Amino acid sequence: AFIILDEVIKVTNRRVNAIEHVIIPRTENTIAYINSELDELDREEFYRLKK
Amino acid sequence: AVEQGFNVKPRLNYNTVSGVNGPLVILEKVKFPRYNEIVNLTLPDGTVRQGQVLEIRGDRAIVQVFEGTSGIDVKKTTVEFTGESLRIPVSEDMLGRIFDGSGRPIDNGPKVFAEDYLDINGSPINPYARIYPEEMISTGVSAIDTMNSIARGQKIPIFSASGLPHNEIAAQICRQAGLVNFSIVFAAMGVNLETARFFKQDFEENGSLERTSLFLNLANDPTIERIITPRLALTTAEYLAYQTERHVLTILTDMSSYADALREVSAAREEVPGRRGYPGYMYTDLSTIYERAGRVEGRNGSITQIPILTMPNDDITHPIPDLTGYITEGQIFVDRQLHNKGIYPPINVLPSLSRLMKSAIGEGMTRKDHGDVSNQLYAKYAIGKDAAAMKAVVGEEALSIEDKLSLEFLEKFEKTFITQGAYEDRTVFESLDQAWSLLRIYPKEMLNRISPKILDEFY
Amino acid sequence: AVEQGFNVKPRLNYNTVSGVNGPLVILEKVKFPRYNEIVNLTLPDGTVRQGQVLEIRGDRAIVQVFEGTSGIDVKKTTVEFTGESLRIPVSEDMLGRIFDGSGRPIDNGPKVFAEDYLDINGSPINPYARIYPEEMISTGVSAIDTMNSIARGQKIPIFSASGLPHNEIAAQICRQAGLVNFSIVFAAMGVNLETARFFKQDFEENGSLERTSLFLNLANDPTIERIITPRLALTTAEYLAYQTERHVLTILTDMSSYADALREVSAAREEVPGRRGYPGYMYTDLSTIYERAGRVEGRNGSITQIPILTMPNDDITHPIPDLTGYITEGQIFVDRQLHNKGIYPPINVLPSLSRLMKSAIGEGMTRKDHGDVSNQLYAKYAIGKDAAAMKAVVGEEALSIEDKLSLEFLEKFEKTFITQGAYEDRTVFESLDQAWSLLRIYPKEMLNRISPKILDEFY
Amino acid sequence: YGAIYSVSGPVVIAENMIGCAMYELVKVGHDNLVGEVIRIDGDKATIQVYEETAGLTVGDPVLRTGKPLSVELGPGLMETIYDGIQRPLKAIKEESQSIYIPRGIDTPALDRTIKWQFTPGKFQVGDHISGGDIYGSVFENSLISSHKILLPPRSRGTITWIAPAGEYTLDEKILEVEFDGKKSDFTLYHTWPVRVPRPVTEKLSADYPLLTGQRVLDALFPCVQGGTTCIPGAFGCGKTVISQSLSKYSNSDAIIYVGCGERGNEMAEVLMEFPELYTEMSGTKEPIMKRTTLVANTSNMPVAAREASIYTGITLAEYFRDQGKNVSMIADSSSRWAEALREISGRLGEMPADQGFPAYLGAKLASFYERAGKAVALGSPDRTGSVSIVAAVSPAGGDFSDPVTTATLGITQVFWGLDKKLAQRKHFPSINTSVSYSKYTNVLNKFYDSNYPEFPVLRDRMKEILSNAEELEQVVQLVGKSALSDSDKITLDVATLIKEDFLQQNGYSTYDAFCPIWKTFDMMRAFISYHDEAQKAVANGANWSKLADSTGDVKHAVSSSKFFEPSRGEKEVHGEFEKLLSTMQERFAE
Ligand SMILES: Nc1ncnc2c1ncn2[C@@H]1O[C@H](COP(=O)(O)OP(=O)(O)O)[C@@H](O)[C@H]1O
């Protein structure tokens, strides 16, 4: 039971560290890039309407 | 007082109509076109249509006639200028009547017998004369009246999605609102006709109409009338509260519909749209509409506000929710998950808060345990949500005692406390008693946010 | 008796040119200008370029020059008004001919001996005079013949991207697009010489030059003729299919390039733009092009459009693929991810769709199991993609037995069923048998989408 | 008699036209192309031509008709196909004898050669008649056995002469109304502007439900006879299939299938499929095309016709409501109506507001949707009609943030949101259960208590089960489904079964094309009873794995409940589900 719990805890801690360090910066950067891209599209539409 | 009204002002009838573009009617050779002047066009078929001028030039006015321009002819269309912007005949007897988007009564009763003609735009309240909201308005909604308190004179909006029963919650609040005199002023803009008749029969058959000046604006009703409606409700509220010394608690419905109406009014004047198509000055317009509420030092009345929004795509980053959150203090959220899980009201307390709650939940007003009970309930609801998420992760057995009890509290909270009948009225004291009844499943040591004296006296 | 009239109509030579903005030539003193009228711009050099009138004022007539405005002056440029819209000389002899983007032959042959002149814009085919396409085209591609069926009279584009083998897939369909022979009208709009030579070689090897017509508007050709090419090709296809009772398989390529030509013309006209600067009427123009395909009552011919659309950034939300998928009757989706994996044809079956599959894949037309097998393959491929995502994110050991079986199904579906290679020629029945071999991995209990009778009969 | 001064595409600008009115139909060109004046900038008058402007020169005559866009309401429109305006496509094909539509053809919207049987109503000569009153009953079809000849609204007076019972055409006068001195004459048909809502005495609250047939709709997100619904979703997703399902199998007594911005082959499929299907609403089974009208406007027709077809369909539905028939109009591609509006606004030059759409998009959509609702038609005798507006929306890119989607979502009461992910997996009807909603459940509690008392409780239970299972599935995706609770696994399995055998039905399969209200209620009760039995048995102590192994037969029976054929009638189908409950209860003992 101790060995199985050690393996499970190692896998879970690796999963938490992976989730945070990889995914959360990755998804946050994707959100920022998407917001920037739609902001650029809105700015282009605004410029066309101003013209 | 109002004695200069005994003056007959002749009205100029301009046959000259230069152009008719979209919803606008462009006149020509006008004498002295006042901005925002109300205009009564006379179609060749004989129908009369109200209008409001949008852009002014040298002997040229652009009239934005209501009900569209279908039938407007250049050759034969008399245009009558009323040398005054839109004004409503306010009275103390308009409590108990239903008015249209343009202020015309749509009741079986007569036109309201005026006491004064107030400009719908109104004047800004002097900040030196403004007063911090102090007392509570008791609402039948136990979730609101306990966890997100409404103080007399604040602006607390309700954020909802399209399908959530925000209109039903509005009707419930209008029916059960009261002091813990009162006179609700209800304004619905861009509302579906089924919801409008629902408001009609609800207020007529529950006795709430003797205290409500209902302002219904249909979706098919004119969009400029949709613009005018919240101004009408706030002007009536200003009259009642400040020139009558009573509390109002206006409930504006479909601020999203009002924002769309503002969009159409702005784009009709050849103006570029702002961020999400909405006009850039939407912040200023919403600020006027909202900050038209509040308490004053000289008068004993108050104007509370519950502008009920409809968040498109359930996005808080949407301009209308963002600007409303900026201008107003606090917010009440209606949750799609809660609506799917159960029944009225689908209000979740985790994202919903009231900024001036501490003033409403005091010692002399309501009960001295209100703040502690509400904070404890919020904390234990958060812990219950965490435990509900954690059960499927770590198994039900492995949860601690403080997590199993918190899950039981969450069940009895989303199923008995928040869950309220659409017609049942819960006073603030009864709601606090029920909150204690839920909180008594814990050991006296578990309740940490509550003060020891309150725990000893109430638990 | 066919009635054709001899008549000579003199044409005014307007020397007055008052603007050569971009690809648009603006005349000044036109007498009774005619909208959508062909004009000939005799350049000072001597060469004449066709033009089309896009807008007429009281005296102005804005003309878009198909061959470009390079070299156009004001003093010595004379515009000759032909007085009629563009009418391509159509004949049954056009089969085997290679034409330019403007309909002028480039196959070192004579001008087509006209049997009739037909308006390029055509007319809307009467919805009451249409026939629902029910005969299924047994394209050799398994990913199409199964799970997205093509009928005679369908408008099913190929949504691809830059570098993907859309040309190869369309050429494969053209080689093997028999029933369960097809004349081909191939329209090239701004494709490169590599693609044009590939298609010409593709047709010559398969013997299609005996019954094909090509309208090659290469990338070197002027960009405005990309507007005129698809209309020419489709009116030729309409002539053949209806007035000759042939079975035309129209293959438009670079509809994205056609839409870019529209944007270039729309931007020059300074019209109010839609999404990404594309004209607000691009939906109407694309619909006019696409909806010229289908079966007609009484006539024994049909048009089967397969417009090769290349999505600019592999994003189906782009206006061109969005409107094309909204207008047409389906789409064949070519996946960059599958191409990177090395699967040919890289047809991503999930985004792909055939709205006529429901009527063309019934009993009698094909085997009784076609619809059930297609639905089951779709469901299991979606489950496979979800299981692949789960394996990528969560650990592989956490995947269930069903998840592992579905991963194996995805592997053998992509690497054995979709992978076909050119010249393979899978019959519909053979493709269905291979699909059943794929579905025999699962126990009969797991196959939910298969009806019990078909499951008993074929498993 | 004006003259074109500019064309610039579909929007001609005719000059020297004084006295014009907005939305007045002028006859542009020598071919008498119809139009609609939409800007009067002095002498000039911008006109949106409903036909293909190609050849119109500067100097061609434009003449003002003297009437807004009016449909020819009356007997003769119950199986015909109409263009964006109101032009019989069958008559056009039979007259021009061409596969195309001739440019500027002038064919009457109603067939004036058909002799219609007429039978006068209770009104007699000398009686005072009011607008909307009934003064006849024309036998049109087997299904439409009495087409009431309504007196036109806004036209009243004293009846001076009425025609006796006999066979009359659509041009023979039938009624002479004295009115205020001027003796008008009323024939069988009567025109009415399409942008002016037809008058009603008083609208009511729609109570009886519109049985869509689809289990997801009719169970979780019901609609009422008179409600406004939307089905937004990207291309695909089954918007058109749901529309045709409600067109074929519905409780409505009449239907107007508007097809603005729709493929021609969609209308061809409707015309080929509808005559095959039959309904027993009348005494005997009769074809669908005897109660279905198609305002078919293909996507290649001018955008002005796309704009006009929505109003033409809604006013036809309003007419059949005024007759007292429960109509359910099904608009197709309301987003394409909005796209036509956007194109027209762009050609005019008006400033777009939201994502290129015009600013008045919300106002136009509200004006169109508000025409719905149960209402008592004005005039005697009293009779109740309904116009259910089942309009399909196709947002660009499949995002529900589109301006047309947002406006329609705010205006309507029901929302059958579709998901591209479910559509591509062929999980039709592909209803996005999380986002979809219905505001008519509160009203429908009364009908449910009358007919199927347990229906609201079962629907709420299934919604709660689906939401709980969605949360549990999110947690499973997060945490690898490690040591999931037995009850949690039960809810996950039950919800997967519900999604795969109750919310997934092939609308084209013979057995699941139409799931009636009784069959879907029995299936709901069977699913809920299975879930409750599993919950109770596991709470007793039974392991879920062994329980599933033992009750796989019952689970397969509940799955095959979707394969149960509704054609056997209520008596046979209800008895079959009675055995399923008995079998499910039997497994509880074991
Ligand atoms: N309820 C359903 N049953 C069976 N097939 C369906 C169903 N709904 C949609 N489909 C399939 O989806 C395909 C296209 O759907 P359709 O309704 O044409 O999309 P759109 O709404 O974009 O027109 C059709 O070929 C049809 O087979």
Ligand SMILES: [Mg+2]
């Ligand atoms: Mg469709």
